[PDB]
Design a protein around this ligand. Structure first.
Ligand SMILES: *C/C=C(C)/C=C/C=C(C)/C=C/C1=C(C)CCCC1(C)C
Ligand SMILES: *C/C=C(C)/C=C/C=C(C)/C=C/C1=C(C)CCCC1(C)C
Lengths: 217, 216
């Protein structure tokens, strides 16, 4: 077992404990609907299985297949929270989910590219889609909370802030590592791509679910 | 000049004449707002330039064309569906983004070494495309039911035409060198010249003349 494998196995253990936690919470719901629990549970399982694949073995192909599914589901969870006590705006949800899939596919195309100028344009394409996500979660998604209580609005702000900080991390780590400028080697890059998603997948959903449970009482 | 190059140049001239026509119509608009003309003009210009580049993976620029023109085509279709009502921009964005997923999936599929990987990405693109088809036939179609039956009937003809052509793309892809290889690159190129002509000039021609005739 090499270092990358070990980091991946640790991440797999992390996902496993978070999903069990979310499962445990789902059994004593405290006013939180089951669909929120189930998505919160599915995210780390999907990511867990993708990382397990890498642990058993372009580099880290499975990382993209993880993101293909987990990142729109994370936006779904964020969107459910913003609209917790109102009608769910499904086309807004759909907008955010699909735009986020463009970010990931752009990243993958970028990483599959042999010419540097092409690689970076696809990266920029990914960043642009990501900027639309950030505009989306800070403006129209955020305005949905204004018709609801300030407890919910405050919870959202905390969640969207935590969400934003972590998500900005991905394009940065991508571009400083072997896929981009090569300022860091693959093993350190893998390490950051374990630490960052643990907080995005377990950390975020943990704050989401506990926030919603305390808000209900 | 070889055969594909000639086909791409004929396509360029096709795009050029379509773009001039729509520009000409915009000067006597008949109640059709300028933004609909401008998108109708932009589509074949973008496509023409991508094909011009090709005339001067195989056919990369074909995807870069699609990256832009297919969501713009969905923008036009949407504007038509909501011609005499408030624009549902989140519905528009959903269709536009989902359509970009179709194209990026298509490209990733075409970039894939392993066959099983190629085909899964193809399937993913087909799934996103199925969601587009559901979108244009259901929530987008429902927008027309609040408006006049003349508009509703026009949309019905337009969405049918739109749907028929768009189904051709995943077919032409899979039967050519990117898929099963039932047809060579030259014939594949020929189809990828015919189909877009009808999707870009044909559809916008029917959209614009349909809306103008509806207003009188
Ligand atoms: C659990 C995993 C998460 C939340 C991953 C998020 C990943 C991103 C926000 C990736 C963004 C990228 C760009 C904005 C530019 C292209 C490169 C990507 C895919 C790393
Ligand atoms: C002017 C060009 C147009 C309207 C192109 C449309 C292209 C498609 C609808 C392509 C669809 C595909 C799939 C559904 C599966 C993946 C392969 C593609 C990209 C050919």
């Amino acid at each position: 077992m090499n270092l990358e494998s070990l980091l991946h196995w640790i991440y797999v253990a992390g996902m496993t404990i978070g999903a069990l936690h979310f499962w445990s919470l789902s059994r004593n719901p405290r006013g939180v609907p089951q669909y929120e629990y189930l998505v919160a549970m599915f995210i780390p399982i999907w990511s867990g299985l993708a990382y397990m694949a890498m642990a058993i073995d372009i580099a880290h192909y499975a990382r993209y297949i993880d993101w293909m599914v987990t990142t729109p589901l994370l936006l779904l969870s964020l969107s459910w929270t913003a609209m917790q006590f109102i009608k769910k705006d499904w086309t807004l949800i759909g907008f955010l989910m699909s735009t986020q899939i463009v970010v990931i596919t752009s990243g993958l195309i970028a990483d599959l590219s042999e010419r540097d100028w092409v690689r970076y344009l696809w990266y920029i394409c990914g960043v642009c889609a990501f900027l639309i996500i950030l505009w989306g979660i800070w403006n129209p998604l955020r305005a949905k909370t204004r018709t609801q209580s300030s407890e919910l609005a405050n919870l959202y702000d905390k969640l969207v802030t935590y969400f934003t900080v972590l998500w900005i991390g991905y394009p940065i780590v991508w571009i400083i590592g072997p896929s981009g400028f090569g300022w860091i080697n693959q093993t350190i890059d893998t390490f950051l791509f374990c630490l960052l998603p643990f907080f995005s997948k377990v950390g975020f959903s943990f704050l989401e679910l506990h926030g919603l449970r305390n808000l209900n009482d």
